[PDB]
Design an enzyme around this catalytic site. Structure first.
Site, PDB file in Angstrom:
ATOM      1  N   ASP A   1     -15.566 -45.670  63.699  1.00 31.75           N
ATOM      2  CA  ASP A   1     -16.152 -46.638  62.586  1.00 31.75           C
ATOM      3  C   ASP A   1     -16.120 -48.109  63.261  1.00 31.75           C
ATOM      4  O   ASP A   1     -15.648 -48.126  64.292  1.00 31.75           O
ATOM      5  CB  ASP A   1     -15.404 -46.439  61.203  1.00 31.75           C
ATOM      6  CG  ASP A   1     -14.154 -46.974  61.169  1.00 31.75           C
ATOM      7  OD1 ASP A   1     -13.533 -47.441  62.260  1.00 31.75           O
ATOM      8  OD2 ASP A   1     -13.840 -47.476  59.906  1.00 31.75           O
TER       9      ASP A   1
ATOM     10  N   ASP B   1     -14.408 -50.607  62.675  1.00 34.75           N
ATOM     11  CA  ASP B   1     -13.609 -51.567  62.917  1.00 34.75           C
ATOM     12  C   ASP B   1     -12.388 -50.723  63.967  1.00 34.75           C
ATOM     13  O   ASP B   1     -11.457 -51.235  64.241  1.00 34.75           O
ATOM     14  CB  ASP B   1     -12.683 -52.126  61.815  1.00 34.75           C
ATOM     15  CG  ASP B   1     -12.266 -51.291  60.979  1.00 34.75           C
ATOM     16  OD1 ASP B   1     -11.205 -51.437  60.155  1.00 34.75           O
ATOM     17  OD2 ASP B   1     -12.679 -50.032  60.628  1.00 34.75           O
TER      18      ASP B   1
ATOM     19  N   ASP C   1     -10.404 -47.861  63.195  1.00 39.22           N
ATOM     20  CA  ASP C   1      -9.496 -47.258  62.575  1.00 39.22           C
ATOM     21  C   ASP C   1      -9.615 -45.899  62.060  1.00 39.22           C
ATOM     22  O   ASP C   1      -8.648 -45.056  61.695  1.00 39.22           O
ATOM     23  CB  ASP C   1      -8.454 -48.247  61.719  1.00 39.22           C
ATOM     24  CG  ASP C   1      -9.365 -48.122  60.432  1.00 39.22           C
ATOM     25  OD1 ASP C   1     -10.713 -48.156  60.390  1.00 39.22           O
ATOM     26  OD2 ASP C   1      -9.013 -49.256  59.499  1.00 39.22           O
ATOM     27  N   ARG C   2     -11.120 -45.502  62.266  1.00 39.49           N
ATOM     28  CA  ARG C   2     -11.299 -44.048  62.020  1.00 39.49           C
ATOM     29  C   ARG C   2     -12.095 -43.561  63.304  1.00 39.49           C
ATOM     30  O   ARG C   2     -12.596 -44.148  63.881  1.00 39.49           O
ATOM     31  CB  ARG C   2     -12.197 -44.153  60.763  1.00 39.49           C
ATOM     32  CG  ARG C   2     -11.792 -44.457  59.682  1.00 39.49           C
ATOM     33  CD  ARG C   2     -12.321 -43.872  58.404  1.00 39.49           C
ATOM     34  NE  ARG C   2     -13.559 -44.572  58.209  1.00 39.49           N
ATOM     35  CZ  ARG C   2     -14.631 -43.978  57.659  1.00 39.49           C
ATOM     36  NH1 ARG C   2     -14.594 -42.739  57.285  1.00 39.49           N
ATOM     37  NH2 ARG C   2     -15.841 -44.764  57.476  1.00 39.49           N
TER      38      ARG C   2
ATOM     39  N   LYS D   1      -7.301 -56.923  55.735  1.00 38.64           N
ATOM     40  CA  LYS D   1      -6.277 -55.836  55.630  1.00 38.64           C
ATOM     41  C   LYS D   1      -5.122 -56.772  56.155  1.00 38.64           C
ATOM     42  O   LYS D   1      -5.062 -57.469  57.171  1.00 38.64           O
ATOM     43  CB  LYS D   1      -6.477 -54.716  56.739  1.00 38.64           C
ATOM     44  CG  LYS D   1      -7.794 -53.899  56.227  1.00 38.64           C
ATOM     45  CD  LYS D   1      -8.167 -52.814  57.192  1.00 38.64           C
ATOM     46  CE  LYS D   1      -9.328 -51.871  56.843  1.00 38.64           C
ATOM     47  NZ  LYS D   1      -9.714 -50.712  57.536  1.00 38.64           N
TER      48      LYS D   1
ATOM     49  N   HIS E   1      -8.698 -41.663  59.290  1.00 37.64           N
ATOM     50  CA  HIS E   1      -7.677 -42.452  59.368  1.00 37.64           C
ATOM     51  C   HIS E   1      -6.513 -41.618  59.877  1.00 37.64           C
ATOM     52  O   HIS E   1      -6.200 -40.737  59.237  1.00 37.64           O
ATOM     53  CB  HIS E   1      -7.079 -43.206  58.268  1.00 37.64           C
ATOM     54  CG  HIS E   1      -7.982 -44.395  57.910  1.00 37.64           C
ATOM     55  ND1 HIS E   1      -8.219 -45.524  58.426  1.00 37.64           N
ATOM     56  CD2 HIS E   1      -8.632 -44.634  56.495  1.00 37.64           C
ATOM     57  CE1 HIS E   1      -9.267 -46.431  58.013  1.00 37.64           C
ATOM     58  NE2 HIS E   1      -9.419 -45.611  56.869  1.00 37.64           N
TER      59      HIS E   1
ATOM     60  N   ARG F   1     -11.735 -56.720  49.688  1.00 35.98           N
ATOM     61  CA  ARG F   1     -13.122 -56.391  50.311  1.00 35.98           C
ATOM     62  C   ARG F   1     -14.261 -56.980  49.558  1.00 35.98           C
ATOM     63  O   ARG F   1     -13.901 -57.015  48.267  1.00 35.98           O
ATOM     64  CB  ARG F   1     -13.333 -54.771  50.187  1.00 35.98           C
ATOM     65  CG  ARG F   1     -12.544 -53.789  51.196  1.00 35.98           C
ATOM     66  CD  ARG F   1     -12.679 -52.311  50.922  1.00 35.98           C
ATOM     67  NE  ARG F   1     -11.356 -51.555  51.435  1.00 35.98           N
ATOM     68  CZ  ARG F   1     -11.709 -50.496  52.514  1.00 35.98           C
ATOM     69  NH1 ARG F   1     -13.011 -50.298  53.134  1.00 35.98           N
ATOM     70  NH2 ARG F   1     -10.649 -50.157  52.880  1.00 35.98           N
TER      71      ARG F   1
ATOM     72  N   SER G   1     -14.805 -53.103  57.586  1.00 33.82           N
ATOM     73  CA  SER G   1     -14.780 -51.747  57.832  1.00 33.82           C
ATOM     74  C   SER G   1     -15.881 -50.971  58.314  1.00 33.82           C
ATOM     75  O   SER G   1     -16.328 -51.396  59.498  1.00 33.82           O
ATOM     76  CB  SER G   1     -13.862 -50.838  56.941  1.00 33.82           C
ATOM     77  OG  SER G   1     -13.681 -49.477  57.070  1.00 33.82           O
ATOM     78  N   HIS G   2     -16.395 -50.075  57.362  1.00 32.81           N
ATOM     79  CA  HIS G   2     -17.651 -49.206  57.990  1.00 32.81           C
ATOM     80  C   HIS G   2     -18.894 -49.806  57.014  1.00 32.81           C
ATOM     81  O   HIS G   2     -20.046 -48.934  57.208  1.00 32.81           O
ATOM     82  CB  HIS G   2     -17.504 -47.712  57.441  1.00 32.81           C
ATOM     83  CG  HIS G   2     -17.337 -47.402  56.171  1.00 32.81           C
ATOM     84  ND1 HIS G   2     -16.192 -47.529  55.530  1.00 32.81           N
ATOM     85  CD2 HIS G   2     -17.969 -47.369  55.381  1.00 32.81           C
ATOM     86  CE1 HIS G   2     -16.071 -47.230  54.049  1.00 32.81           C
ATOM     87  NE2 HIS G   2     -17.427 -46.849  53.869  1.00 32.81           N
TER      88      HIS G   2
END
Ligand SMILES: O=P(O)(O)O[C@H]1O[C@H](CO)[C@@H](O)[C@H](O)[C@@H]1O
Ligand SMILES: [Zn+2]
Length: 458
Positions: A237, A239, A241-242, A113, A324, A15, A103-104
């Protein structure tokens, strides 16, 4: 090879900040390191995806080139949700995959990832990539890139296994992240009417940040659900995945309560199944899973760590408080907000009651919002280590698998180090306000006994 910053190599993934700790060159050498590790594991074939960030196109070409420069056969799936990249690494030839995503986080953030030969990398495996680059322990070869349009296959795989018993009207908030490429369309295809909010992919994130874990980012969703008399609200979110969830009356269903519904569902068809949840989840989930004859397994926070635990236990389902959610039953075991939304709609559509009543039926405790205390990156683990050595918690079930969690007869408390920010994360929940305060006081005193200067903003 150049000298990349150590700070971008984190416990769960890589990240960084584009222009600052993450450049095009860094994406290249990270691609080289991943390609080398994949080949060392016998896997020349690697899928590559990216989210809808402004830096996506520039960094993804460099990631791909680093992989081909090892001799890897890359499958370029283009711009997709994170879970669609994981899907590709389960259905294409290779079991390796890299997702370029921030991500967020705010617009300038990006990251990687990484799945190698089936394994999601974490901890010392991420460090091993950093180390390959420093050592020039890197493969060299003449690889290749093939473009793969995988989104239609993912779409159909979900659609053909979800069986909604009746129509629902759902508001879907994508937060201008990449979920807008498939989630509204797929949910409609399941048999829903969809009211879109921020479903245009836009890496400037001009509306609210795509982070459904913060109630403020669900304000617009809650209002639209109520204004349109919708059955459910869903937020993804950045990407995908949430997932976050709100009922027809606007109640936020936090992912640990979501998991209760999913756990009932999965265990009903799979007696004795392991069900994993992180240390941030309500204790009520332990009793609920046990009551249905499931085996509740508490584990470390962090998507990569939960994924590894899935493999080690054979768990058919896992979930984190952050949203997740990882279905192995009827699925592949990776976290996927879109697939999780589809599973939620299937269950809700088979119930005559509204979503508010379906969720309000489950036992509830009084909970805190997340508490965060800023410390330093180089002291956060030592504070935890000192608590684990020195602290006294009174009578309770103490778990130190991630920080210190103590489960008391009428509530629980948690303190752990974040692996994405320089912060201690705390959660408290209890039967009553009185017990909530008793537990908070225990934790306040134990923090102060380690370091009397620590903030205790609770
Ligand atoms: O608490 P941490 O270490 O900062 O990790 C947080 O972000 C992770 C990545 O989304 C999540 O996987 C975790 O659940 C959590 O929300
Ligand atoms: Zn995400």
């Amino acid at each position: 090879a150049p000298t990349l910053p150590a700070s971008i190599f984190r416990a769960y993934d890589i990240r960084g900040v584009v222009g600052d700790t993450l450049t095009a060159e860094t994406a290249y050498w990270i691609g080289r390191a991943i390609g080398s590790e994949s080949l060392a594991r016998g896997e020349p074939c690697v899928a590559v995806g990216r989210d809808g960030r402004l830096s996506g196109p520039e960094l993804v070409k460099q990631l791909i080139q680093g992989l081909v420069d090892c001799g890897c056969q890359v499958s370029d799936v283009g711009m997709v949700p994170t879970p669609v990249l994981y899907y590709a690494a389960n259905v294409l030839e290779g079991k390796s995959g890299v997702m370029l995503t921030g991500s967020h986080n705010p617009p300038d953030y990006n990251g990687f990832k990484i799945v190698v030969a089936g394994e999601t990398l974490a901890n010392e495996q991420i460090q091993a990539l950093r180390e390959r680059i420093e050592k020039n322990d890197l493969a060299s070869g003449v690889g290749s890139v093939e473009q793969v349009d995988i989104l239609p296959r993912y779409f159909k795989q979900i659609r053909d296994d979800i069986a909604m018993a009746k129509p629902m009207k759902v508001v879907v908030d994508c937060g201008n992240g990449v979920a807008g490429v498939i989630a509204p369309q797929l949910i409609e295809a399941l048999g829903c009417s969809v009211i879109p909010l921020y479903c245009e992919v836009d890496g400037n994130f001009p509306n609210h940040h795509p982070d459904p874990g913060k109630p403020e980012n669900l304000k617009d969703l809650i209002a639209k659900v109520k204004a349109e008399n919708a059955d459910l609200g869903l937020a993804f979110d950045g990407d995908g995945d949430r997932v976050g969830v709100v009922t027809n009356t606007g109640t936020i269903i936090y992912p640990d309560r979501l998991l209760m519904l999913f756990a009932k569902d999965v265990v009903s068809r799979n007696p004795g199944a392991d069900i994993i949840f992180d240390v941030k989840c309500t204790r009520r989930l332990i009793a609920l899973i046990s009551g249905y004859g499931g085996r509740p397994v508490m584990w470390k926070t962090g998507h990569s760590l939960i994924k590894k635990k899935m493999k080690e236990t054979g768990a058919l389902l896992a979930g984190e408080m952050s949203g997740h959610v990882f279905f192995k039953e009827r699925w592949f075991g990776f976290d996927d907000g879109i697939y999780s939304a589809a599973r939620l709609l299937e269950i809700l559509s088979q119930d005559q009651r509204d979503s508010e009543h379906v969720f309000s039926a489950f036992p509830s405790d009084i909970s805190t919002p997340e508490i965060n205390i800023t410390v330093t990156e180089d002291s956060k683990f030592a504070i935890i280590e000192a608590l684990q050595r020195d602290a006294q918690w009174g009578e309770g079930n103490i778990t130190t698998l991630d920080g210190v969690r103590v489960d008391y007869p009428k509530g629980w408390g948690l303190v752990r180090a974040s692996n994405t920010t320089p912060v201690l994360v705390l959660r408290f929940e209890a039967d009553t306000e009185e017990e909530l305060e008793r537990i908070k006081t225990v934790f306040r005193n134990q923090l102060k006994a380690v370091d009397s200067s620590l903030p205790v903003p609770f």
